[PDB]
Design a protein around this ligand. Structure first.
Ligand SMILES: *[C@@H]1O[C@H](CO)[C@@H](O)[C@H](O)[C@H]1NC(C)=O
Length: 368
């Protein structure tokens, strides 16, 4: 162990590599997560937290983490590339808290100020105080959509790494809320909230490989909502998903990106989804032997008694008539699992960054 080597960043190419890696990472996470219900998560927040862990990792841990994230061997410019994947529709901030008995290397301190515009903050002796500090930080950076990321903060806690994302954007064409209706849905039968518009601009086509309608609704700030729905009842969402390889996914997004928007009768489920998940436990389905038992964060601190055992992830995502709001946070911390969802007809969706070409949020609606 000796950090700090990216001085020259060729922005087209490191951008392409990183977007591609986040795509791959997104699909791996999606697939591990779908192994049957309704959820949303932010592969980008999760990648961002793990890349912060990576900034302070030693050799063996770097290796595992890079493979999980599909980053190439060499990619020292990742952190600078990742820093400029923030948009005006999407915010991303990162922060560390530590006990005063955990010394953070100066080198880690410098890198953290450069990349995150933040310095490590000190925890106090009080468990409840620390919890409010942290949870308030997250709230502050998710427009209060995530007001309680952590349930508790054990007394033995010496390190918290966090990331928080806030995405907010308007539809180019809004829906009319007098046309929004609670519509029957077959499922004890229920009613579900449905935004309707007879001539909405959707770019869409059927892909013969997924056997699926592919559609995109345009938002401001180069973000879109991308939807994949099985093309009819003969095909289940699981088959579509398993066909969704990285090459298939990328070929869809390419064709999608040249497709014209055209007036389309649209009955958009008015999705509100809140998901909390131990994402380490999902992450961990992507490697055989668990990296955490040899956790080497010598980049971050000389202290050897640091242990990573969970990662809280929470996503809140809301479609309205005016736009989308999606918040996510991820922490290396104690985690709880709760999936809150409104049942609907099956599809996958993404909030896609059409500038940097990766999924900021991904989600699934399933009809059991
Ligand atoms: C970190 O940055 C400070 C400047 O504020 C500098 O004095 C110090 O040399 C740097 N630490 C190391 C060892 O990289």
């Amino acid at each position: 162990c000796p950090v700090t080597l990216c001085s020259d960043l060729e922005s087209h190419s490191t951008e392409a590599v990183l977007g591609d890696a986040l795509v791959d990472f997104s699909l791996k996470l999606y697939h591990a997560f779908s192994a049957e219900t309704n959820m949303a998560f932010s592969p980008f927040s999760i990648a961002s937290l793990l890349t912060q862990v990576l900034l302070g990792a030693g050799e063996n841990t770097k290796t595992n983490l890079e493979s999980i994230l599909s980053y190439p061997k060499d990619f020292t410019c990742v952190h600078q590339a990742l820093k400029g994947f923030t948009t005006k529709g999407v915010t991303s901030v990162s922060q560390i808290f530590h006990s005063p008995d955990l010394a953070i290397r100066d080198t880690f301190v410098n890198a953290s100020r450069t990349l995150y515009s933040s310095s490590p903050r000190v925890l106090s002796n009080n468990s409840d105080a620390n919890l409010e500090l942290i949870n308030t930080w997250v709230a502050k950076n998710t427009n209060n959509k995530i007001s309680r990321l952590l349930d508790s903060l054990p007394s033995d806690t010496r390190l918290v790494l966090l990331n928080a994302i806030y995405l907010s954007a308007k539809w180019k064409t809004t829906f009319d809320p007098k046309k929004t209706r609670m519509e029957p849905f077959h499922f004890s039968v229920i009613k579900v909230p449905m935004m309707n518009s007879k001539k909405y601009p959707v770019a869409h086509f059927i892909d013969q490989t997924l056997k699926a309608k592919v559609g995109q609704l345009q938002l401001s700030h180069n973000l879109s909502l991308v939807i994949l729905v099985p093309q009819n009842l003969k095909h289940r969402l699981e088959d579509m998903e398993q066909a969704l390889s990285p090459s298939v996914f990328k070929a869809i997004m390419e064709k999608l990106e040249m497709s014209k928007f055209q007036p389309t009768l649209l009955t958009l489920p008015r999705i509100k989804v809140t998901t909390s998940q131990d994402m380490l436990s999902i992450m961990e389905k992507l490697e055989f032997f668990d990296f955490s038992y040899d956790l080497n964060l010598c980049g971050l601190t000389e202290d050897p008694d640091l242990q990573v055992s969970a990662m809280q992830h929470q996503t809140v995502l809301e479609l309205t008539e005016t736009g989308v709001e999606a918040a996510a946070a991820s922490a290396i911390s104690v985690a709880r699992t709760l999936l809150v969802f409104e049942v609907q007809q099956p599809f996958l969706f993404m909030l896609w960054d059409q500038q940097h070409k990766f999924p900021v949020f991904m989600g699934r609606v399933y009809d059991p």
